[PDB]
Structure 1
Amino acid sequence: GSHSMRYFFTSVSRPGRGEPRFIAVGYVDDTQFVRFDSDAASQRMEPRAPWIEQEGPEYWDGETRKVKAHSQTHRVDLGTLRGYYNQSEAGSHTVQRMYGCDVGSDWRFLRGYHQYAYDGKDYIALKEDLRSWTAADMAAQTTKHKWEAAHVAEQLRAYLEGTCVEWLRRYLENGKETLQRTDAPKTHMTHHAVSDHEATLRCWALSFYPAEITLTWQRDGEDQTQDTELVETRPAGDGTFQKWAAVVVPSGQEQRYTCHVQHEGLPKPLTLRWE
């Protein structure tokens, strides 16, 4: 029953080919519900989930205004970081920001976060007390000093503990058919020879939501984690997710291997066997 709301922002500079490209998406748990693309024609925040379309024009006008505002800060931020790092305009660079809040099964506030990355590396992050910052390098310390003098964490903590929690609950209620479901994985194993003496064992989980899942292989009860191929959890395209784990084993030894599946939709963890 735990839930998150998260906003993700990406701005990428493109020297002498216009203003930076800004893309923004919003999620409730593993379900996208809004997008903004600075290259798209609408120049509006757009719905991406059925249950958010019911919001009135005040909502859409205001979220468009605010997301364009985020677009403008990240545009200044790209210039700021160029200065902090003595970088020219020969290069495209990337700023990323993520913030949001978590509630428990009781829908009361759990924790909040607000993070930045520059060119793929941690830059600065709000710590879990929502009072202090983690600055990754000397440039981010400069930001930290400015944000402490400007009392940035106070203002974020008020948003994260208030507005963020209240609208997460609203969205959870309005989209409860979509959001408050749990779809347990449908699981099976496949077997295919790779030679006259070896076979691929692959453990599948399909049609599950939310995306959180654990698949492990054991051999005679011993975890084979170092020997397992694990693909990244992937979307089916319909709001559910897929995952598999494979080992290559000696033909004859299939009965030693078991797959173990953990997901919140299963009353108990599953063990799949070759007998």
Structure 2
Amino acid sequence: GSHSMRYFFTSVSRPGRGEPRFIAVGYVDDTQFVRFDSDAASQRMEPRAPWIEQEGPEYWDGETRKVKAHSQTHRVDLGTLRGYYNQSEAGSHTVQRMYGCDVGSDWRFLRGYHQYAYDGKDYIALKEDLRSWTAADMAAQTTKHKWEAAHVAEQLRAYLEGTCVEWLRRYLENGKETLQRTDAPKTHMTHHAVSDHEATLRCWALSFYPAEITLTWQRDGEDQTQDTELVETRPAGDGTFQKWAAVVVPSGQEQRYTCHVQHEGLPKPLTLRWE
């Protein structure tokens, strides 16, 4: 199947309580593999998947230096952004950055991305061509001018198209057991009366990987999207995911309702029925 490597960085200011909180995590697909936490004792980039543990001391030293450099940049950013938006110190603010690369089933580069947000909203992002920027407001235009004058996109492009893809392939190979697996969902539906005249029908998918999945309800073949409660896909904690969708239906009409499950691990999409 297709694959991705992504790094996620969050910095949060806490004025009058010292330095900002900085957390970095890295993922291959839906499997986390590294972390750094600025408040933690180690001050090291740390392994969070078995297959990254074999990387040598140069790797861990080098990744620790990178993540500390990102932390210092974001620390400065929190100050700069307060100035750009004429904000006070009375409150906490959040910078987020995420970047990485996608590859197809043949492990060739599909696309790259490098995005930044301030207080939960898009701030600036590299466009699809990896040569130009989308700035979301006027403050982010200032950053665009500075990043264009400094040729930031060219350095990012070299990473996203090259280095990023090379390390993703390395990780896919070393962690093949975990990363190149598909676990198809184990599916069922549950039925519970909510009164003498209505029932909740809940369609379940369990123990699947990767996390991408579609669960839908139909009534006589007609999608019931406005009437469906669909929960966020959630981790089981063992490396697999769970999700459910529910509808509340008049008792006696169960046989009109079907749940439909799509996942890359299934040989064909499943239709679950009450008959």
- 2-side partners of 1:30 and 1:137: how far apart? 31
Aligned length in residues = 275
Q: Secondary structure at the match of 1:162?
A: helix
Q: How big is each residue's C-alpha offset from its partner over 1:209-235, in whole Å with a ceiling of 9 and x where there is no partner?
A: 000000000000000000000000000
Q: Secondary structure at the match of 1:165?
A: helix
Please state how far the C-alpha of 1:269 moved relative to its aligned partner: 0.5
Residue of structure 1 equivalent to 2:47: 47
- Greater mean alpha carbon deviation, residues 125-134 or residues 29-38: 125-134
Consecutive unaligned residues in structure 1, runs of 5 or more: none
Please state how far the C-alpha of 1:46 moved relative to its aligned partner: 0.2
- Greater mean alpha carbon deviation, residues 245-254 or residues 147-156: 147-156
What TM-score do you get using the length of structure 2 for normalisation? 1.00
Please state how far the C-alpha of 1:173 moved relative to its aligned partner: 0.1
Please state how far the C-alpha of 1:50 moved relative to its aligned partner: 0.1
Q: Secondary structure at the match of 2:155?
A: helix
Q: Secondary structure at the match of 1:183?
A: coil
Q: How big is each residue's C-alpha offset from its partner over 1:39-60, in whole Å with a ceiling of 9 and x where there is no partner?
A: 0000000000000000000000
Greater than 3 Å deviation, 4+ residue runs: none
- 2-side partners of 1:222 and 1:108: how far apart? 38
- 1-side partners of 2:18 and 2:232: how far apart? 34
Q: How big is each residue's C-alpha offset from its partner over 1:7-39, in whole Å with a ceiling of 9 and x where there is no partner?
A: 000000001101000000000000000000000
- 2-side partners of 1:22 and 1:95: how far apart? 9
Please state how far the C-alpha of 1:82 moved relative to its aligned partner: 0.3
Q: Secondary structure at the match of 1:66?
A: helix
- 2-side partners of 1:108 and 1:271: how far apart? 34
Please state how far the C-alpha of 1:175 moved relative to its aligned partner: 0.2
**RMSD, matched Cα:** 0.4
Please state how far the C-alpha of 1:174 moved relative to its aligned partner: 0.1
- 2-side partners of 1:106 and 1:245: how far apart? 33
Q: How big is each residue's C-alpha offset from its partner over 1:69-125, in whole Å with a ceiling of 9 and x where there is no partner?
A: 000000000001000000011110000000000111111111000000000000001
Q: Secondary structure at the match of 1:156?
A: helix
Q: How big is each residue's C-alpha offset from its partner over 1:102-153, in whole Å with a ceiling of 9 and x where there is no partner?
A: 1111111110000000000000011101111110000000000111111111
Residue of structure 2 equivalent to 1:265: 265
Consecutive unaligned residues in structure 2, runs of 5 or more: none
Please state how far the C-alpha of 1:176 moved relative to its aligned partner: 0.1
- 2-side partners of 1:82 and 1:195: how far apart? 54
What TM-score do you get using the length of structure 1 for normalisation? 1.00
Residue of structure 1 equivalent to 2:118: 118
Please state how far the C-alpha of 1:259 moved relative to its aligned partner: 0.2
- 2-side partners of 1:128 and 1:185: how far apart? 33
- 2-side partners of 1:52 and 1:188: how far apart? 35
- 2-side partners of 1:242 and 1:273: how far apart? 20
- 2-side partners of 1:50 and 1:254: how far apart? 45
- 2-side partners of 1:221 and 1:154: how far apart? 50
Residue of structure 1 equivalent to 2:74: 74
Q: Secondary structure at the match of 1:32?
A: strand
Q: Secondary structure at the match of 2:199?
A: strand
- 1-side partners of 2:234 and 2:53: how far apart? 26
Please state how far the C-alpha of 1:3 moved relative to its aligned partner: 0.3
Residue of structure 1 equivalent to 2:192: 192
